[PDB]
Swiss-Prot record:
It is found in: Host membrane; Host cytoplasm. Responsible for the cleavages located at the N-terminus of the replicase polyprotein. In addition, PL-PRO possesses a deubiquitinating/deISGylating activity and processes both 'Lys-48'- and 'Lys-63'-linked polyubiquitin chains from cellular substrates. Plays a role in host membrane rearrangement that leads to creation of cytoplasmic double-membrane vesicles (DMV) necessary for viral replication. Nsp3, nsp4 and nsp6 together are sufficient to form DMV. It is a multi-pass membrane protein. Residues 2-67 form the DPUP domain. It comes from Severe acute respiratory syndrome coronavirus (SARS-CoV). Its cofactor is Zn(2+). It catalyses: Thiol-dependent hydrolysis of ester, thioester, amide, peptide and isopeptide bonds formed by the C-terminal Gly of ubiquitin (a 76-residue protein attached to proteins as an intracellular targeting signal). This is Papain-like protease nsp3. The hydrophobic region HD1 probably mediates the membrane association of the replication complex.
């Protein structure tokens, strides 16, 4: 799955652009990309809804936003 493969790829780097991977499941998804105060989440199930701060993002947006 496209979105799933994004989770997958960042795991292999442990990071993306300037951010850091995580992987701590919580109530609110699993902790994704951390950078400073910004914690992206992703859903366990599909389609993988990426979130940040409270904005559910989309896959193409997310990359652009992680810049």
């Amino acid at each position: 799955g496209s979105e799933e493969h994004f989770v997958e790829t960042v795991s292999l780097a442990g990071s993306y652009r300037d951010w850091s991977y995580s992987g701590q499941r919580t109530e609110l998804g699993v902790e994704f990309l951390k950078r400073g105060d910004k914690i992206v989440y992703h859903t366990l199930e599909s389609p993988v809804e990426f979130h940040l701060d409270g904005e559910v993002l989309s896959l193409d947006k997310l990359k652009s936003l992680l810049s």
